Amino acid sequence: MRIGFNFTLGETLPLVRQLAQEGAIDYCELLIDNFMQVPPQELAEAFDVPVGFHIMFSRFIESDEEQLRDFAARLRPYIEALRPLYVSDHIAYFSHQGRALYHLGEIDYAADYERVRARAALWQSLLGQTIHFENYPSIVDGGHAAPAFFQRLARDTGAGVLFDVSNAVCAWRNDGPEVAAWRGVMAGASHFHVGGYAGAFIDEGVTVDTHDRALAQDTLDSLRRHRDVLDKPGATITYERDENIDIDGVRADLLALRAIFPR
Amino acid sequence: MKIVIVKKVEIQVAGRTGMRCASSCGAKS
Amino acid sequence: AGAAPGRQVKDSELLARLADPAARGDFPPGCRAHVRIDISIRAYWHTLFDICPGLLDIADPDGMAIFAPFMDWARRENLTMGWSFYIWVGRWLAQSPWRERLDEELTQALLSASAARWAVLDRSADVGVVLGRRGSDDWIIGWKPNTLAAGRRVELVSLDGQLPRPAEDVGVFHLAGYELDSFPGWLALPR
Ligand SMILES: [Fe+3]
Ligand SMILES: [Fe+3]
Ligand SMILES: [Fe+3]
């Protein structure tokens, strides 16, 4: 199990390079659509280690098809240049009746499967790459169906599941399904995420996917419980921190993960 | 046509952590 | 179980409420449905006031003499809540009970905020957005980052006054490269 760190801000490159040298990360996961004006060759010459792609705003389910074809065309040079270990994207509502959602919406797993299927099949063809799709940190109801949803999406289109273990404990803390309900997906999955979470400002009893703190114990205890079906040759797990990105806090979590998945 | 530039200066706009930023999947804090 | 007492509530059942501050009242505190709406209102809140804190001095210190009514007006004008967001709270502030305090300090902060937002969020092949004001011949330009040493850069560019000012209060055009050396003509704020 190789351990990675997410890279969304260029300003954090000195920090990623030094964690690459202490051997605290083995690969690095770029939020690739944040760098699509950085020359592909220049991007590639910044990382000695291998990389993975994470896409934030393809909007592949809801986007206009020609917009999505152009996004794919502009993103293919980056796949050719950096030759990443994997490509990953999101399943969520980004807008409603044309108006942006600043906090993404959970899709209707029952009602929306056929539109997601058709667009995931297409989106993978337009990139020429398998895409692993990330589960949502559910807050309200309906997310009990996500494990079946993701398995069916993988059987039907050949996609992968980028399983965010931390996002699954957020759903579990929000009365969603047990993290154990994902063991089937974990056994078939090769690429994973984990990050910190926090409570909502007005109610600490609901858990929010903030990626701004240290790993919580139920997060680490769920990695230990299912270490048997997460570790495989070629597997990766990306630690994600998007706020409070200081070297000491991040190193504490990257070394806590290697304490669960030693070299 | 013809743009007559005489002075540029950067404007600070707040951002993420150390600012000058980019998107991310985490919810606001 | 249930995100509301006695009711299952899927996120699709709540999307019409996610940018409406008044909707918080439609579910009891303590149910997951109520918190979810709030989580998202505080997302809009922070996007406006964490970036343009000049708004918070005006009216109440929690800004919700400005925040709550603007959000109601945004929905009526069917705004997309895209990057032009900050310029639209400017347009609302123009006909507001707080129309005073419309500092050119604060109007440029809001346009700068919307230039930076375009540069961070836009996923087209363009690399620059330029904003022209009604009372000046200066431009504000938002640039997408093309290196990893710096993020998005917004610039105040001073020009001689020979190029047409935007006909409306604000005007926009986009740049396909990191070169400013032609004038296509102003287009309208994209809503
Ligand atoms: Fe997460
Ligand atoms: Fe994640
Ligand atoms: Fe993600």
Residue numbers in the entry:
A (entry chain B): 1 to 263
B (entry chain A): 1 to 29
C (entry chain C): 9 to 199
Can you list sentences taken from the study reporting this PDB entry?
To understand the mechanism of how MbnBCs catalyze modification of MbnAs, we finally solved the crystal structures of VcMbnABC and RrMbnABC at resolutions of 2.2 Å and 2.7 Å, respectively. Similar to MtMbnABC,17 the three components of RrMbnABC formed a stable complex when co-expressed in Escherichia coli. High-resolution mass spectrometry (MS) indicated that the absorption resulted from modifications on either Cys21 or Cys25. In contrast to VcMbnA, the C-terminal half of the RrMbnA LP (residues 15–20) forms a short kink, which interacts with the surface loop region of RrMbnB. Formation of the kink allows the second cysteine residue (Cys25) to coordinate to one of the iron ions in the catalytic cavity of RrMbnBC. The divalent ion (Fe1) coordinates to VcMbnAC18 in VcMbnABC and to RrMbnAC25 in RrMbnABC, providing direct evidence for cysteine modifications of MbnA by MbnBC. RrMbnBC can modify either Cys21 or Cys25 of RrMbnA as indicated by MS data, but only Cys25 was found to coordinate to Fe1 in the crystal structure of RrMbnABC. This may be a more energetically favorable binding mode for RrMbnA to interact with the catalytic site of RrMbnBC and could therefore be more readily captured by crystallography. Consistent with this hypothesis, our enzymatic assays showed that RrMbnBC was active in modifying MbnAs from Groups I–V. VcMbnB Asp240 and the equivalent in RrMbnB, Asp242, are conserved among MbnBs and are located adjacent to the apex of the curved portion of MbnA.
